[PDB]
Amino acid sequence: MDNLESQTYEVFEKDPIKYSQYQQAIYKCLLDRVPEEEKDTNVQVLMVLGAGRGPLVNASLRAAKQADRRIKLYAVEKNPNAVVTLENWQFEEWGSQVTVVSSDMREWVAPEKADIIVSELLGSFADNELSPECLDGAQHFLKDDGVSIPGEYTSFLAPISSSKLYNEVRACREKDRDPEAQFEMPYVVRLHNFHQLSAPQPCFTFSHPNRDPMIDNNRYCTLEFPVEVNTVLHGFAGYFETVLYQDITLSIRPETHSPGMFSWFPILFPIKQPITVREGQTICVRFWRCSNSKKVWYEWAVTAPVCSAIHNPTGRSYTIGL
Amino acid sequence: MDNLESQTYEVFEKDPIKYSQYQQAIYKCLLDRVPEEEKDTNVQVLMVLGAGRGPLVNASLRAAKQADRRIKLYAVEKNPNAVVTLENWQFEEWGSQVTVVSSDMREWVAPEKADIIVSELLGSFADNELSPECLDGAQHFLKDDGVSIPGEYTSFLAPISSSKLYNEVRACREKDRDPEAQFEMPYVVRLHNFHQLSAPQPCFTFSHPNRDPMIDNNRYCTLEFPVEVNTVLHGFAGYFETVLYQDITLSIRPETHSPGMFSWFPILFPIKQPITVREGQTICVRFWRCSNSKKVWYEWAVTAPVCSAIHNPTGRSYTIGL
Amino acid sequence: EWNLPPNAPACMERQLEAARYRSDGALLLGASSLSGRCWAGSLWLFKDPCAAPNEGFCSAGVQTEAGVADLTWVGERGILVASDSGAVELWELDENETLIVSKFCKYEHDDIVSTVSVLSSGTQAVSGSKDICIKVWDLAQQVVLSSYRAHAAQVTCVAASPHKDSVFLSCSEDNRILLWDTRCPKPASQIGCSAPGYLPTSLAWHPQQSEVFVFGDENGTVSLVDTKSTSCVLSSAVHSQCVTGLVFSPHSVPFLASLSEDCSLAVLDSSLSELFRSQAHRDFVRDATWSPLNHSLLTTVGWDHQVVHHVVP
Amino acid sequence: RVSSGRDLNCVPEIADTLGAVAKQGFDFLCMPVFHPRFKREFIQEPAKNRPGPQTRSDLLLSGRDWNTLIVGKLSPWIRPDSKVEKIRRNSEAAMLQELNFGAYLGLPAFLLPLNQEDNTNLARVLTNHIHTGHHSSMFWMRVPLVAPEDLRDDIIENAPTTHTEEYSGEEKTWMWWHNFRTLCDYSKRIAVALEIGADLPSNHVIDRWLGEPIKAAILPTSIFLTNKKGFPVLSKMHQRLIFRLLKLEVQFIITGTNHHSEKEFCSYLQYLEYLSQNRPPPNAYELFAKGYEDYLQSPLQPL
Numbered sequence A, B: 001m002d003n004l005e006s007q008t009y010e011v012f013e014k015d016p017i018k019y020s021q022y023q024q025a026i027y028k029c030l031l032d033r034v035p036e037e038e039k040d041t042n043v044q045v046l047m048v049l050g051a052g053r054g055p056l057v058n059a060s061l062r063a064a065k066q067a068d069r070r071i072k073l074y075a076v077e078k079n080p081n082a083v084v085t086l087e088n089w090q091f092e093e094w095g096s097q098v099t100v101v102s103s104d105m106r107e108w109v110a111p112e113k114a115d116i117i118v119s120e121l122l123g124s125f126a127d128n129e130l131s132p133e134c135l136d137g138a139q140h141f142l143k144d145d146g147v148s149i150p151g152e153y154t155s156f157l158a159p160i161s162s163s164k165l166y167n168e169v170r171a172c173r174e175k176d177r178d179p180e181a182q183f184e185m186p187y188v189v190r191l192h193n194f195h196q197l198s199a200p201q202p203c204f205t206f207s208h209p210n211r212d213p214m215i216d217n218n219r220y221c222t223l224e225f226p227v228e229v230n231t232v233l234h235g236f237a238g239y240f241e242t243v244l245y246q247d248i249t250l251s252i253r254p255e256t257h258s259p260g261m262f263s264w265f266p267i268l269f270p271i272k273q274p275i276t277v278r279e280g281q282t283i284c285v286r287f288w289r290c291s292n293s294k295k296v297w298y299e300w301a302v303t304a305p306v307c308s309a310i311h312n313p314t315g316r317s318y319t320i321g322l
Numbered sequence C: 001e002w003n004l005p006p007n008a009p010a011c012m013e014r015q016l017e018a019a020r021y022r023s024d025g026a027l028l029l030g031a032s033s034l035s036g037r038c039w040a041g042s043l044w045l046f047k048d049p050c051a052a053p054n055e056g057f058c059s060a061g062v063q064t065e066a067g068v069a070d071l072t073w074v075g076e077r078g079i080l081v082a083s084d085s086g087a088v089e090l091w092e093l094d095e096n097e098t099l100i101v102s103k104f105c106k107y108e109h110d111d112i113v114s115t116v117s118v119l120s121s122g123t124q125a126v127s128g129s130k131d132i133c134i135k136v137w138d139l140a141q142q143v144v145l146s147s148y149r150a151h152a153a154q155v156t157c158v159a160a161s162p163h164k165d166s167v168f169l170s171c172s173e174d175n176r177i178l179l180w181d182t183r184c185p186k187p188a189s190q191i192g193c194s195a196p197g198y199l200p201t202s203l204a205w206h207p208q209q210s211e212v213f214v215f216g217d218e219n220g221t222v223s224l225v226d227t228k229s230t231s232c233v234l235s236s237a238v239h240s241q242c243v244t245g246l247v248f249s250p251h252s253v254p255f256l257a258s259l260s261e262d263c264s265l266a267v268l269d270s271s272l273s274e275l276f277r278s279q280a281h282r283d284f285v286r287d288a289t290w291s292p293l294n295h296s297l298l299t300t301v302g303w304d305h306q307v308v309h310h311v312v313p
Numbered sequence D: 001r002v003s004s005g006r007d008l009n010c011v012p013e014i015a016d017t018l019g020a021v022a023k024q025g026f027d028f029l030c031m032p033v034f035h036p037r038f039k040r041e042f043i044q045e046p047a048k049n050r051p052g053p054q055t056r057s058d059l060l061l062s063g064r065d066w067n068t069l070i071v072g073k074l075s076p077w078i079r080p081d082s083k084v085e086k087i088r089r090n091s092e093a094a095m096l097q098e099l100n101f102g103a104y105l106g107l108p109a110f111l112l113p114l115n116q117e118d119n120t121n122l123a124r125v126l127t128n129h130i131h132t133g134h135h136s137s138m139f140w141m142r143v144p145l146v147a148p149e150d151l152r153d154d155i156i157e158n159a160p161t162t163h164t165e166e167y168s169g170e171e172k173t174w175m176w177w178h179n180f181r182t183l184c185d186y187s188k189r190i191a192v193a194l195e196i197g198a199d200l201p202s203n204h205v206i207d208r209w210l211g212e213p214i215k216a217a218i219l220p221t222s223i224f225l226t227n228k229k230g231f232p233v234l235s236k237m238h239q240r241l242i243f244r245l246l247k248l249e250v251q252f253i254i255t256g257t258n259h260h261s262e263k264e265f266c267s268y269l270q271y272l273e274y275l276s277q278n279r280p281p282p283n284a285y286e287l288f289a290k291g292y293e294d295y296l297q298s299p300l301q302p303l
């Protein structure tokens, strides 16, 4: 529903890992797809979905001249403001090796099918920017043997204690809305003054492409967290992992964090009321991913050691627009 | 976005005019479309769009056995709850002359094109239930020479004075929302204790089918109302007129009101602040019909004798879901 | 690119603004860069008219500083330019005609100069701007002689009469068409059918009566006006968008060329009936010029960067 | 010392232009975001499908330079209140487009003219913009002291300029702006860029913009007089205005070409600095009351 500002792209483009990791993913995939004798006979068609100011496009060009293989590029991008940068790059530099498309990927009528699609449409909880829906809406123009980059991503949750953060969320009450809406939406936050009560566990997973007979992106999952200290639960830190290609990955899960990657902070899922937890007990929580045609949202509850209110029922406090 | 309750259908089905007027419209149209010698050779295909509990369907059956002509019926209906009544009627009574379809008309893949489509999808301000959008989304399955019933409708506005109603709207402030949202959405209301400051004037018109090259349902219109008394403006009463077929019409415009038709009250468009008007002056107001892919809304202002705030900018206080 | 002779720039900017046949038979081109990094303009001479817009097959070329909003021939070697810079500039062609040189560049308008026209004698010119002013120039002197704030909005089009060196028509977005005559103490006079029509967007004098002209409006209508009668003689809905230009043919009983933002060309007869129509362009149509050598040939340029030669029945 | 910008409507190279003006002494630049003449189409084919790029690339300046140095201008062809439906629609779309672009660039301010009585639709498009997404940019309205129509030379023989006074007619311009910010519901993001002319209006109608959210004053080059030594100055009355405007700590904006080639643009600017230097000096109260202006405190519960 909204468009990223120039300065936003600017800051994230400087990531020292996200980009080289993608270059390396396309590199590996190109080889696995066109064998040495075929190198000049076979030109792989590559589509970048959400091309921004073009760094993934450049990185593709860098991948091909590293694999020493040949590629046709599309740069699809919904933000018309960014599409301006792109269209300037392609006249000044790229040439007609890159076709720039100014539309949504759910919408674009592709002149031809793709060998590999490529996207980074992920948020700190993996699928919280509707990359499922976008890549699902685009996959009809991927060749039957086509690769998606990324191939999969997986979300995670760990319970945390932090009065400091509980108090910051509380402080987010606004006039003219539910006096408890603050509590029913996830915050992107650099988690600092906090305690992690249990090791993260996987939450939601999506694979691409979705060879699913009839596709469904909704989810419900139950997690049990062993707690071995006394404390008070104030919410859940979410993180994610993703497979770009084969062994080439990115992660913000602390135990596998990608060294030097600053592109994503963790997410916070608060709870309306803090819950005491005795040393020895299990925290059971539950998450649902929900949707209609217009929006996708999360809803969640704690069921042990006591219950909370089901949070965010209906996306009444927050949804992400489709 | 919502579904009408059984009792709602029940009450409106008892209208003594809306129904006979439709019967008469289909009757006239059937004749004009199949000539006396062709009567048994030609079976007109008739689609009822938003069939409810089936009274328009029955009325079509009554029209054909009055024109003494032959018809194939579809009864499309989005409300699955009503679709239950329909599917019961068609097994107990109608037989396979009626095909009942349980879907949206924007969505239905029609097995065949129609001679005549039929709908009553109108609200007190004519197009305030998104009948434009619905019939536009359905018209691809209407034969190239196909009739729509209704053929057109037209909205109207008249300025009014009423402290009583100004105070009722005011009384509609709710917790947890803009303390002035009450003022930025139109109320269906039986207008009683009020003064009408100027004669109604036409506002928005839509024709069906829309042979428009590229279709656009958005609108902007400016109205000037002569005022010949001193007073205070508190809002605008909207009404509507519609042509079903040729001379057969329905209306809630007072000067042409359909005798005995209770099916629609007028609508009220309030204004945040009341405006004094000197005897002799002109009230200029302005209305826009606005939309995106998800929702349609109205926005309006007074520009003479003084300005008001542009009301409802963005559909922030109210929209109708698509 | 056969040679792109000395001083001509490497590339020609996409947005073609103007096209003018010399009595000689050659073709003058104006071009703006209206998007991308550099917002400039350029001038071109094409002795081979069939070879345009191809840069290497040109006789001469030169980068202007800013874009070219309008231009016109001066005599036979002179090129008078309406700049974005607020400048009116005069470029004079080489003696061999293989080089194009600055003569004067005067920054006298406070905003983009949008229209320029050469007066009958050929010694003077009148320009119009978004600064709402209209100016009369001594071309030999390189000075503004007269300045006129007649209008209340930006000036859209100025046009010198065929034969009278002191009469010119101007039109602006303030909804006025003005008949000028500098001989009067109060120069301008407001001519029109009556009270507010749609905004006037283009003008052309009849090449045969200093008495009659056509104007085009923002709604796609071309109309025919008699100053001698002050009433609206005849009109027609020729376009689906703005009418940006009107050009009479050299024929004895002349034809009228009519260009528009609907990307189409139309040719009209005496009574404004449609004789021809062309969709050749896929962006805006900016200028039309009739061949001096072949009077059934007509050339048009657009923002699609096409230079297009029409054969007219 | 005052903060002041240049108002250009022509920029061939954005790098070079910015350098020029800053080297001339200016604090910031008013320039277009799309080419002023680059009319775009949004509905009808084929023009609708015109190959891009629609404009320059952001990469041409640092984010910091955008945020701090450039004030956007709305393209002059954009006429949302045209009586021609098709023009109205393209103007809507174009205005949105240039607005979202300014926001994309994070420009500190963006300029929009009130040069006629009716700006209902311009206002409605802008309100609509303000309540969409998140940005903090200021919107400056270019309103003139004296309407363009009341400034025209009396040189149309058959349409004279109605000679003797109308108290209301000298004020019409304030009502253009009044109505505009009432419809926009006194947004705090919409302020005034008042244009000064050669002929000041009656003192009363200057009074009129007392109290209003003036954030800038636009002085065209063409209203400066010229002294014994060919330098540009202002009439006595024009100085009264500057001094008043200085109190409001407005930013100044020079517009139009140089009309004294005998020196740089920096001379106009130099003069302004001279007037700021030579203001009726700050006193005991005024020095003290400095960082407190228009700041509302609730009084104390004294007991």
Ligand SMILES: O=C(NC[C@H](O)CN1CCc2ccccc2C1)c1cccc(NC2CCOCC2)c1
Pocket (backbone or CB within 6 Å): A004, A008, A009, A011, A012, A013, A052, A122, A123, A124, A129, A188, A262, A263, A264, A265, A266
């Ligand atoms: O996790 C964050 N935001 C969730 C977003 O989906 C992050 N992605 C990161 C990838 C990306 C690429 C292009 C355009 C936008 C984005 C947004 C986030 C938000 C603000 C700041 C940061 N972290 C860094 C810390 C180091 O300095 C720069 C900000 C991270």
Ligand SMILES: O=C(NC[C@H](O)CN1CCc2ccccc2C1)c1cccc(NC2CCOCC2)c1
Pocket (backbone or CB within 6 Å): B004, B008, B009, B011, B012, B013, B052, B122, B123, B124, B129, B188, B262, B263, B264, B265, B266
């Ligand atoms: O104008 C009204 N509502 C706007 C609706 O679009 C009316 N139409 C009327 C046609 C119709 C048919 C089937 C299902 C729903 C509807 C709704 C309205 C609402 C409540 C009551 C009434 N009026 C009558 C007055 C006589 O007694 C029964 C209620 C009118």
Ligand SMILES: Nc1ncnc2c1ncn2[C@@H]1O[C@H](C[C@@H](N)CC[C@H](N)C(=O)O)[C@@H](O)[C@H]1O
Pocket (backbone or CB within 6 Å): A004, A009, A012, A013, A049, A050, A051, A052, A053, A054, A055, A056, A076, A077, A078, A079, A082, A103, A104, A105, A106, A120, A121, A122, A134
């Ligand atoms: N459905 C969609 N269709 C087309 N583009 C999209 C869609 N959803 C998101 N985008 C764009 O995808 C980009 C996501 C960015 N994380 C990637 C930016 C760029 N590739 C970079 O890594 O720097 C943004 O520019 C979005 O505007």
Ligand SMILES: Nc1ncnc2c1ncn2[C@@H]1O[C@H](C[C@@H](N)CC[C@H](N)C(=O)O)[C@@H](O)[C@H]1O
Pocket (backbone or CB within 6 Å): B004, B009, B012, B013, B049, B050, B051, B052, B053, B054, B055, B056, B076, B077, B078, B079, B082, B103, B104, B105, B106, B120, B121, B122, B134
């Ligand atoms: N887009 C749509 N597709 C299918 N049905 C619809 C749609 N929009 C509205 N309807 C149905 O149309 C009906 C509108 C009613 N006014 C008509 C009811 C019934 N025909 C009657 O006159 O008693 C409702 O039953 C709606 O649920």
